[PDB]
Design a protein around this ligand. Sequence first.
Ligand SMILES: OC[C@H]1O[C@@](CO)(O[C@H]2O[C@H](CO)[C@@H](O)[C@H](O)[C@H]2O)[C@@H](O)[C@@H]1O
Ligand SMILES: [K+]
Length: 263
Amino acid sequence: QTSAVQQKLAALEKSSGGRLGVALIDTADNTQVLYRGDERFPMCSTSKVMAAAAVLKQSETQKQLLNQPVEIKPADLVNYNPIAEKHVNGTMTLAELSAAALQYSDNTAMNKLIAQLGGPGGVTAFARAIGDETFRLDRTAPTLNTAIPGDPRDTTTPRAMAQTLRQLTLGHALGETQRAQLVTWLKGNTTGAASIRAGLPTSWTVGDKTGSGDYGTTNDIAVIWPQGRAPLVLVTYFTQPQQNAESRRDVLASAARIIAEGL
Ligand SMILES: OC[C@H]1O[C@@](CO)(O[C@H]2O[C@H](CO)[C@@H](O)[C@H](O)[C@H]2O)[C@@H](O)[C@@H]1O
Ligand SMILES: [K+]
């Protein structure tokens, strides 16, 4: 069936010129709204959530892991390193790297998390351990953001990512302390006000992670606490046909607005 909300999302998509993917889980009733929910999309930096979460999971059996220092060398700096570049020839702890990756989208910090997990496949292995059979991370940053149409590397589906984000932030994929830390980090994101958040009523609370890459890829994944409603999880992925396309955070905001109006 096609719902009214799906109809509106299809109209948004057609006016956007790109390809939109949406998955909502409403934890009031566990119902779901999906638009291209089983198509693959390039995650770009939304994959940082899974990497940070995997390190949180490791910290459940090492109480001191988040205070472990990691050396930052000049050679480690990549294309976007607003926090790590201050620490070159110095160190950052795994907590500092997780915070920098999630809240500032620091790519050097992401690469340190990936290295702590043994490479991109270690992030995929964590996804599998928590029941996500779809997610794959294949490369480090920044090349995980190439976002080439049809390329399966560094992709997931909206359905899979919404389920996983729910298990991580509202469910029991992580220990209680670790879940709370992940939620605190997401809620402190600096990069999200133009994306899902822009489509929701101001009274609602959001924790989110954005992503962007080539092909005008513009993504956001969020856990939302509506005014007076049980929490939602919302994934919005958007990608375009031309490599040099501009970002379209407004399309994500419009998707979120449609979802909110449909509740
Ligand atoms: O966007 C983060 C970071 O990436 C760079 C290239 O390393 O720019 C890319 O992203 C920009 C924003 O989407 C695009 O405008 C640009 O064309 C693309 O190369 C850095 O300039 C930027 O800080
Ligand atoms: K871009």
